[PDB]
């Protein structure tokens, strides 16, 4: 059906430009309107400019003087670029059909998730978190494995190769410094631990490394 | 820049509610050739927005019946005659009629469930950190309803602001609670100079705090 694809990078570095294409089918540039728009966590949805059927821009004036919109008709493409990318640039961005007269074809791409920073791909330091020598006994114990200093996202932990995933709780990474940190806790019931073993597995595709970590008493 | 201002920031519902979301604009929203163009989506996790409502009170196709907009000028609603679990998901209003156009900050529409304090876990950094001369100590506050919750660090009961990284995750699609973890991250000089480690959690199901400790000597 009516579909707009997106493409473009994951990994932006600061002061440099992002480029994203927008790919129509199901209906004619000629036609409609495309617009840009991105969402981060502080500052939620922003719309950023339009291109017009007709071919003529309109741009956020926050934005203006770095922001470029252009079509390509024939191969229906539409492209952004946004110079001089900053940390605070870090979104997903997202082209749509809206502002809407129409019944039909209103939709928006799958969004591209865009980072700034110059950091290196550095493999996480991966430890296992078991409970404090004098804790207090439940009928079920929580463990933990903690995941920290890599660089880019993601990384991908299961326990026990996968075989533990019910009581799983995995915490999205947060930028400590300019690299990243999670953690990861599962719950088992007391009776199984330490008699059956516990490892969390942390896989880092960027920097090719898997890492096995078995939870043992302190 | 027109304001579009979204009540309330989240709306707790049970499925079979009714549910009405509200946006006041900082102006009135004047037509353009003919068209008042304030639309309301809906965006799921990890998903796009989708458009539900174009020009005020037009549902667009595929859209369900219990889905409807109202208003003028500049204040506009949004009502669901009958929650599904398809409608959980934040809701936002936007205004195409004057540049720059704009969205609403966002409703939460979430699933309301029976009261759960969080079940609360510390632990103390692992051996193979200390060597490396870190020392984070870890708190899980996990699957705890309603969202409301504040966690405090104290060293030798003595408060702690610095160092702490909060990271927490979106209401869980099968239980309907919440999540968080709580990173103390200090180095480890600093860590061996106390004894004393507590993660202390304030929330709605009780007055008195949930505290979690160990010390350092065990
Ligand atoms: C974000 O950072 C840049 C570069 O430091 C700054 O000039 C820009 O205005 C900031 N933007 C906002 C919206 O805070």
Same mark, same amino acid.
């Not at chain 2, 409502?53 to 009170?57: D, E, G, R, T």
């Not at chain 2, 195409?96 to 540049?99: A, C, D, E, I, K």
């Not at chain 2, 209401?171 to 239980?175: E, T």
């Not at chain 2, 709605?204 to 007055?207: I, L």
């Given at each position: 059906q009516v579909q707009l694809k997106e493409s473009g990078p994951g990994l932006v570095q600061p002061s440099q430009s992002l480029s994203i294409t927008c790919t129509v089918s199901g209906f004619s540039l000629t036609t409609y309107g495309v617009h840009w728009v991105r969402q981060s966590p502080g500052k939620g949805l922003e719309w950023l400019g339009v291109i017009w059927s007709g071919g003529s821009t309109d741009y956020n004036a926050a934005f203006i003087s770095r922001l470029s919109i252009s079509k390509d008709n024939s191969k229906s493409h539409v492209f952004f670029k946004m110079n001089?990318?900053?940390?605070?640039?870090t979104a997903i961005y997202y082209c749509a059909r809206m502002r809407?007269?129409?019944?039909?074809f209103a939709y928006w791409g799958q969004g591209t998730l865009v980072t700034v920073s110059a950091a290196k791909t550095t493999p996480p330091s991966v430890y296992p978190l078991a409970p404090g020598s004098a804790a207090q006994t439940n009928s079920m114990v929580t463990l933990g494995c903690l995941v920290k200093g890599y660089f880019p996202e993601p990384v991908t932990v299961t326990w026990n190769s996968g075989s533990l995933s019910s009581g799983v709780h995995t915490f999205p990474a947060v930028l400590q410094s300019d690299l990243y940190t999670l953690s990861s806790s599962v719950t088992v019931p007391s009776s199984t631990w330490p008699s059956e073993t516990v490892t969390c597995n942390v896989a880092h595709p960027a920097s090719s490394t898997k890492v096995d970590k078995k939870i043992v008493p302190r | 820049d027109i304001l579009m201002n979204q009540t309330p920031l989240s709306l707790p519902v049970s499925l079979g509610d009714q549910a009405s979301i509200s946006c006041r604009s900082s102006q009135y929203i004047v037509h353009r050739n003919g068209n008042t163009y304030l639309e309301w989506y809906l965006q799921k996790p990890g998903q796009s927005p989708k458009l539900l409502? +174009?020009?005020?009170?037009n549902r667009f196709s595929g859209?369900? *019946?219990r889905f409807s907009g109202s208003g003028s000028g500049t204040d506009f609603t949004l009502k669901i005659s009958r929650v599904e679990a398809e409608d959980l998901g934040v809701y936002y209003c936007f205004q195409?009629?004057?540049?720059p156009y704009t969205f609403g900050g966002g409703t939460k529409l979430e699933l309301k469930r029976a009261d759960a304090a969080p079940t609360v876990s510390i632990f103390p950094p692992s051996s193979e950190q200390l060597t490396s001369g870190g020392a984070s100590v870890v708190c899980f506050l996990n699957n705890? +309803?309603?969202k409301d919750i504040n966690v405090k660090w104290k060293i030798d009961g003595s408060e702690r602001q610095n160092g702490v990284l909060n990271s927490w995750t979106d209401? *869980?699609?099968? *239980?309907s609670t919440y999540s968080m973890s709580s990173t103390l991250t200090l180095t480890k000089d600093e860590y061996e100079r106390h004894n004393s480690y507590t993660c202390e959690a304030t929330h709605?199901?009780?007055?008195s705090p949930i505290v979690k400790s160990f010390n350092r000597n065990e």
């Open positions: 001089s990318l900053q940390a605070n640039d809407i007269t129409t019944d039909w | 409502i +174009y020009k005020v009170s859209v369900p *019946d195409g009629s004057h540049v705890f +309803y309603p209401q *869980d699609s099968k *239980d709605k199901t009780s007055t």
